[PDB]
Amino acid sequence: MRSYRAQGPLPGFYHYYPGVPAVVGVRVEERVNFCPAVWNTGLSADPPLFGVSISPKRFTHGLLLKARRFSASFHPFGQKDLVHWLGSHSGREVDKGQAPHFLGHTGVPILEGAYAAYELELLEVHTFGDHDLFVGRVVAVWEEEGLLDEKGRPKPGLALLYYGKGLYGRPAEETFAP
Amino acid sequence: MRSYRAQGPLPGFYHYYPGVPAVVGVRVEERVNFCPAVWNTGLSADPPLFGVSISPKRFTHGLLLKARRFSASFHPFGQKDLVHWLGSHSGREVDKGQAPHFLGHTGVPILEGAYAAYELELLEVHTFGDHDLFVGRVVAVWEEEGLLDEKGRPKPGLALLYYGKGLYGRPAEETFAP
């Protein structure tokens, strides 16, 4: 097994990929923006906390600090083109708010087509290197019954997976229970 | 699309699954322990930071606070049974250190069989609800050459995916480049 000493950013920082990209939706007044975030993770079950790591370079970063509320939606692999598009253009140059979406109970924008989504209230923000971790508390849950299994998980092979550098995939349909 | 107000922990907090589980290896003197953590995420590229969210209920939690160093390894689907075993038993009752492993340059224990692994120095620990986020700085990188593509991405179909509640899978071989 090959090894090397970290000397700055890694040639590739994808050893832990793939991951499901969380589409972060945010609304400030009349403006809506969406931004995929593969750097996302559950952070607490009780209470339910979910986090997304966003670079201050993203237009979304400022909107999150202002709104202090946002959505995190999870989409079928069939929407790979849309998710990729949202992650390849900035709200500084294009109104991504025109992408088909609806407003949640708390007013956060939720990208349409998701099999599940969370409406979150910003709890804390922490800076770690070149990205800021936005910790949100889940205040509302959306589920597309026909696309989820008995435990609220996307059905077999439905989840969109991101491998990094514009490459996507999906899970195999077979699952195993050791 | 069904929706409901969060009233506490969700019946099932798996909407953002599956995820690649990071095997956390920690050593305190002669004692070695390993613990899968599906709640993991990249946190910074420059410098390279990686985090794992661990419950204070895990034996690993105390070990991490003592060692202040740990490894995060990523294993092929073929090791599903081993990873599951490590995540179904506690170091409080069994010596998981006997699982085949080697010591990294910084002395952290790395579970054998991984296609990649990070040696991490603990930078910060933050409490978010019922889990603590351990933020580590990548100081050394291990790679099993030939299993990652030119960009450093684990080849499609190789990674172990965790769906929650002891259910595992792997990515499909097919990929997409939108």
Ligand SMILES: Cc1cc2nc3c(=O)[nH]c(=O)nc-3n(C[C@H](O)[C@H](O)[C@H](O)COP(=O)(O)O)c2cc1C
């Ligand atoms: C699949 C995917 C995952 C991504 N993950 C993240 C992430 O976790 N954090 C981040 O800061 N940017 C991430 N990016 C980059 C942003 O999504 C991208 O820069 C986007 O265009 C920013 O839009 P904005 O400037 O309107 O906020 C990701 C991109 C893609 C395509």
Ligand SMILES: Cc1cc2nc3c(=O)[nH]c(=O)nc-3n(C[C@H](O)[C@H](O)[C@H](O)COP(=O)(O)O)c2cc1C
């Ligand atoms: C696939 C998998 C992923 C897991 N992810 C996490 C996680 O992110 N955080 C956590 O605190 N526990 C997680 N668990 C639970 C611990 O791995 C499990 O409680 C383990 O037995 C703790 O070992 P320890 O007591 O020796 O530390 C996970 C378990 C499995 C099987």
